[PDB]
Design a protein around this ligand. Sequence first.
Ligand SMILES: [Ca+2]
Ligand SMILES: [Ca+2]
Length: 279
Amino acid sequence: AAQTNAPWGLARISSTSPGTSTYYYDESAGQGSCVYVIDTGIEASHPEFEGRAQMVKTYYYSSRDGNGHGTHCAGTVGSRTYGVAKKTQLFGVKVLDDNGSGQYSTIIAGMDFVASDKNNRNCPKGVVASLSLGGGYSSSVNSAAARLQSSGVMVAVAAGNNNADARNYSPASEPSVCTVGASDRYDRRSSFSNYGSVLDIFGPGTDILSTWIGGSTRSISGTSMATPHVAGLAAYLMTLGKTTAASACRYIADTANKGDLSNIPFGTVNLLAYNNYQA
Ligand SMILES: [Ca+2]
Ligand SMILES: [Ca+2]
């Protein structure tokens, strides 16, 4: 399948080269997979989700996304126009308040929630969780992310936006999950992207167009935007049977575009998420 005039990040995910604008992907499109977006929530009524999104948990007075960040990330995972895996099931877990903020205790509870709740959902092709969030190092936050991965969920986390080594941030620094840095449309490391030995992969993160609240769209930047490209790619590849939740981060790194990015510090992987789709 070919989506013309796609957001550059989708075109980038299916290309050996920067500078193209068509997204190419197997029409299976992540059907039969599930992606949890653990964030400010998801405006499930957005026409872009086509009924494939729903809220499953909130820790606040409402399950509504009053911010937009979670909706944007969920759109990059699985919206019809802006998404990598256009037929995946999206589940929202609102651990972040409408200011984009959340206590680590709540974030941890959300991760343990997903590890259990996947047993209440039909995901025959496998389960992914996207965590476009983080703060300073916490062994308890990392532990929660490691349990979620151990439970059979492909966990994708943002490296963080500090232009610093991700070793000092959580859940970015948990080694067993898939820690995602950000790149721009000219294959440069995004200026704010964390780096370091703990990164597994880069995805598109600068000037990423996706869904927003109020049934709208906008372009924003962050490792928060790179992370759902990887989460959506994992769900897509798992539907194809190419990989599993336990092995998907390694498979994405194995099959990545190698050495394409500029301003990657010595000791950080130079690997850009790539679906290796050939029509
Ligand atoms: Ca290349
Ligand atoms: Ca890792």
